């Protein structure tokens, strides 16, 4: 049955169990991951409202001078960039993304999107042909099989994880392994099928419109927002858009009992429905860098197309 | 069917004959870049192009005997595996060449029949592709995309003209955005009928994505031998970016006024379309990465025209 979210733990909602799965407001968690930083700020002003907890030390400043400048003189190259990319009411999945050098902490990749009248800034550290390579093969694999196999060994070549499958939702969102790509010595998850509560109704939902999602480290502390509410509204700050967001506590659970350190998933999207997944798993934690990651989110629409083009091949 | 090529002693093409100029078999290419073909199994060097000893610095037989397997060593069994017996002529391979005569090289390889064609282009050694793609999908219907598309591409490539070319049902043309340099005439809202992009140019352009004229008044290089060896017949040409311009075409560029061009195929439910169509007043050889983006581009925006005209439909 599907039921409204309830208010996050910092609001007093109940905490998460198997009975109440749908209902966790998983996109207001109030922190995130802590391998990059991320900043709130007015939309207009540029006045910088929220901080997660471990900004200073990626950007080598004390809290309060942060707090106490706007992004006109904290990023003065790029906050005209940023108000030309992103105007007032357009879409929450519109992003920007500059590379900065940083006295502090060397060359941070910069990603912005808009929510409303919030500008939300994500900083993490960043660092031949084989996009292009993979892009002709992919449009060159004869069938849905062969295209998922290229696919699944294609993103494991890029990425190095330990385990990449190409999870494909049915009807009822209940998920099947289709095709994957894994490191020797592990079982094969191939021709498995999963149930639909195992990744609930607003997880897809979420899914269908910010393509990546990942989980660096099932085993790390989020880092809350300070403070945990958007002053504009005080009310909860959304973070569906936002990669750093931190993973819901049921979903790293489920990890940690599969033995995952480190999990990533593009969505595969289909007549604007979520058709699958390319989900990967590393034993450790793994950090992929921002530069990779765009790699993948490439692939994942030109999957899209693909699985398109195959499928009307076969009727 | 088509006529022959001329070198075969075919008739000259005319505008009576438009359908019929077997442009896949010019024999020649454009002299901004070398090319060889070589046998699939041996790696056997059968034909090449006059300039190839400028690009590779090279004695002109030196290569006409010689073994890719010799001339290039690492790469010779990649492309082996890349591009298998039976692949499609679509398929390409590509690697960048520290080569000793020239700094980098940007190397093309696929593969016909029993012909493997390799060319060889100028190269060297950051977000704006990333930021492009999130631009496209928020664009909220197929107008506001078709603007974006073309400012983007414009943006990136410098191009003094860059369209958005949509074919209607009868094959008429239509620019239906636009994006360019102050100062030039307005093609936005113009119709074009449909034998200035020929029935045989148009099947050419739903399997090879991309093509070029980089200078509308270079003369072509031939190939030598200009016949492939194996079959005593023409190579096939249509997959190669290097292959040269149909001269009925380039005459129509330099009656506009354009000294360089290249569109892009935008194609959707397996047919054509529309085009990226770019024009430059003056010659300009886009370098093979920046081409690369606009192949990754003209993908995007075949997915995303599906997405838009899905939710007018
Ligand atoms: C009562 C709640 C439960 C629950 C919640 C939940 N699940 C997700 C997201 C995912 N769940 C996945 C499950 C699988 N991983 C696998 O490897 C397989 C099969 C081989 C399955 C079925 C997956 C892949 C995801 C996507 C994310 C990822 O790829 O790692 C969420 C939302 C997480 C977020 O957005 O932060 C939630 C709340 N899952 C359950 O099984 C029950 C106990
Ligand atoms: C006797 C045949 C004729 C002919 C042949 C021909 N045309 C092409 C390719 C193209 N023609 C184009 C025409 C236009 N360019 C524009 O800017 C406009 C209007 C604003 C039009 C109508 C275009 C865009 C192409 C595609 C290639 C490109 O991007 O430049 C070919 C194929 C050449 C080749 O692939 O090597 C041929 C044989 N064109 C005519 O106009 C008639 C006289």
């Given at each position: 049955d599907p039921l409204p979210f309830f208010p996050p733990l910092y609001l007093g909602g109940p905490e998460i169990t198997t009975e109440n799965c749908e209902r966790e407001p998983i996109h207001i968690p109030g922190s995130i991951q802590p391998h990059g930083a991320l900043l709130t700020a007015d939309g207009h002003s540029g006045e910088v409202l929220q901080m997660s907890l471990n900004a200073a030390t990626f950007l080598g400043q004390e809290p309060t001078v942060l707090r106490g400048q706007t992004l006109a003189a904290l990023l003065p190259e790029q906050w005209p960039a940023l108000q030309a990319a992103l105007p007032?009411?357009?879409?929450?999945a519109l992003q920007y993304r500059a590379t900065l050098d940083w006295p502090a902490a060397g060359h941070l990749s910069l990603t912005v999107h808009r929510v409303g009248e919030l500008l939300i800034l994500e900083f993490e550290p960043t660092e031949p042909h084989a996009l292009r390579n993979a892009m002709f093969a992919l449009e060159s694999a004869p069938n849905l099989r062969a295209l998922a196999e290229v696919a699944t060994q294609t993103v494991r070549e890029l990425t190095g994880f330990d385990r990449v499958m190409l999870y494909k939702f049915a009807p009822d969102a209940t998920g099947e392994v289709i095709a994957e790509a894994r490191r020797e010595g592990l079982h094969a998850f191939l021709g498995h099928r999963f149930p639909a509560?195992?990744?609930?109704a607003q997880a897809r939902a979420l899914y269908t419109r910010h393509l990546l999602r990942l989980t660096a480290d099932t085993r790390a502390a989020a880092v809350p927002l300070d403070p945990v509410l958007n002053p504009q509204t005080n009310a909860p700050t959304p973070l569906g858009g936002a990669v750093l967001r931190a993973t819901s506590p049921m979903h790293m659970q489920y990890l940690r009992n599969m033995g995952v350190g480190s999990s990533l998933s593009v969505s595969v999207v289909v007549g604007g429905q979520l058709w699958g997944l390319i989900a990967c798993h590393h034993q450790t934690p793994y950090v992929l860098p921002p530069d990779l990651r765009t790699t993948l989110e490439y692939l994942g629409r030109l999957l899209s197309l693909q699985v398109q083009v195959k499928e009307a091949l076969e009727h």
């Amino acid at each position: 049955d599907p039921l409204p979210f309830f208010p996050p733990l910092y609001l007093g909602g109940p905490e998460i169990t198997t009975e109440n799965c749908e209902r966790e407001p998983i996109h207001i968690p109030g922190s995130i991951q802590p391998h990059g930083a991320l900043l709130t700020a007015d939309g207009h002003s540029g006045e910088v409202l929220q901080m997660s907890l471990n900004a200073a030390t990626f950007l080598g400043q004390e809290p309060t001078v942060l707090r106490g400048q706007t992004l006109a003189a904290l990023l003065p190259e790029q906050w005209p960039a940023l108000q030309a990319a992103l105007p007032p009411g357009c879409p929450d999945a519109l992003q920007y993304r500059a590379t900065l050098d940083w006295p502090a902490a060397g060359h941070l990749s910069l990603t912005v999107h808009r929510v409303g009248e919030l500008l939300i800034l994500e900083f993490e550290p960043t660092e031949p042909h084989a996009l292009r390579n993979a892009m002709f093969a992919l449009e060159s694999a004869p069938n849905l099989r062969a295209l998922a196999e290229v696919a699944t060994q294609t993103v494991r070549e890029l990425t190095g994880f330990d385990r990449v499958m190409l999870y494909k939702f049915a009807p009822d969102a209940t998920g099947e392994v289709i095709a994957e790509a894994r490191r020797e010595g592990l079982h094969a998850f191939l021709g498995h099928r999963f149930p639909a509560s195992d990744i609930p109704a607003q997880a897809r939902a979420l899914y269908t419109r910010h393509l990546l999602r990942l989980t660096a480290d099932t085993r790390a502390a989020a880092v809350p927002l300070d403070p945990v509410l958007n002053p504009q509204t005080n009310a909860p700050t959304p973070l569906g858009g936002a990669v750093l967001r931190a993973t819901s506590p049921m979903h790293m659970q489920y990890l940690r009992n599969m033995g995952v350190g480190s999990s990533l998933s593009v969505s595969v999207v289909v007549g604007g429905q979520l058709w699958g997944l390319i989900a990967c798993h590393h034993q450790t934690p793994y950090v992929l860098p921002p530069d990779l990651r765009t790699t993948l989110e490439y692939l994942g629409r030109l999957l899209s197309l693909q699985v398109q083009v195959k499928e009307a091949l076969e009727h």
